[PDB]
Structures are given as structure tokens and as C-alpha cells.
Design a protein around this nucleic acid. Structure first.
Length: 69
DNA sequence: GAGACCGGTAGC
DNA sequence: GCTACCGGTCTC
């Protein structure tokens, strides 16, 4: 799966949260982003390198997908 | 203490 | 060869 749109980002970006199914950290979740091209990102720096100066992710909270002032 | 970040591998 | 997945440290 369920990639929801992410309005805090430019049009076409989707956010997906995945619950860990096994292991000691089973239950925890990993958050992933998807560019219009379909590229998978898993960290705010990855995302910053790919968008460059189009959007400031300093106030951007990676887990929720919202701009936190 | 919490979680962001990313490395290494198990499973395809 | 690729990649999803969980472990583990680093940063706060």
C-alpha cells in the first residue's frame, strides 16, 4: 503493498511503511519513499541527494512524511 | 533511550 | 546479480 501518496513532497511521490515480520526487531517498521520514476529511497539523505535544491528536507520528518516546523 | 541510517546477507 | 530484510551503531 500500500503505497500512499505523500503530499509534503513534489507530485508523484509515494510513501510505504513495512512491518518487520521476523527476528528480534520483528514488529518495528521501515519507511520507504518512491519517486515518480519508481526509484526506492530509504533515508532522508538519499532523498536529499535526489531532489537537490527543489525541496528543503530539514523540517521534513522521514517517518511521517510531513514537514515539521 | 530512541530511532535514523545503512551494511551485509539470505533468498530469489 | 539483485534486493528486501533485519541487525547494529551512531547521533541525538
Amino acid at each position: 503493498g500500500k503505497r500512499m501518496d505523500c503530499p509534503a513532497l513534489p507530485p508523484g511521490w509515494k510513501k510505504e511503511e513495512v512491518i518487520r515480520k521476523s527476528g528480534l526487531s520483528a514488529g518495528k517498521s521501515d519507511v520507504y519513499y518512491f519517486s515518480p520514476s519508481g526509484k526506492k529511497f530509504r533515508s532522508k539523505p538519499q532523498l536529499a541527494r535526489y531532489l537537490g535544491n527543489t525541496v528543503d528536507l530539514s523540517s521534513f520528518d522521514f517517518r511521517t512524511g510531513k514537514m515539521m516546523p
